């Protein structure tokens, strides 16, 4: 009988991550972009939805 | 009829979580010498 496909993405027991960094890579622990001259050298507020 | 009763296994949590009052600054611990008794573990409340 004609059928329409569905797709879930179940992924549990883990946390999402978004490395604050230039190329999203873990090349260190004190990120290359958390040390820059526009974030660690300037105030900044943020809002995320 | 009858049936069995759904199992309910009770048991103390993994690594005994939630049994040592962590992170609740209201009731923290202290590790200070019998000395100037200033607490040595000032735990935040927003750090888990």
């Amino acid at each position: 009988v004609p059928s329409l496909t569905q797709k879930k993405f179940l992924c549990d027991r883990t946390m999402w991550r978004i490395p604050f960094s230039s190329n999203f890579m873990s090349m260190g622990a004190l990120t290359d972009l958390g040390q820059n001259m526009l974030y660690a050298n300037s105030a900044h507020a943020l809002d995320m939805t | 009829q009858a049936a069995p009763n759904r199992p309910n296994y009770i048991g103390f949590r993994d690594n005994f979580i939630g049994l040592m009052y962590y992170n609740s600054t209201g009731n923290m611990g202290v590790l200070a010498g019998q000395a100037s008794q200033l607490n040595a573990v000032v735990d935040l409340q927003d750090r888990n």
Partner: peptide
């Protein structure tokens, strides 16, 4: 496309809204 910024809000003397080291 350097979408440049130019604006850094700091604060005379130059500390940025902050928070210092808690000591025991």
């Amino acid at each position: 496309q350097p979408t440049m910024q130019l604006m850094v809000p700091k604060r005379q003397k130059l500390e940025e809204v902050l928070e210092n080291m808690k000591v025991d």
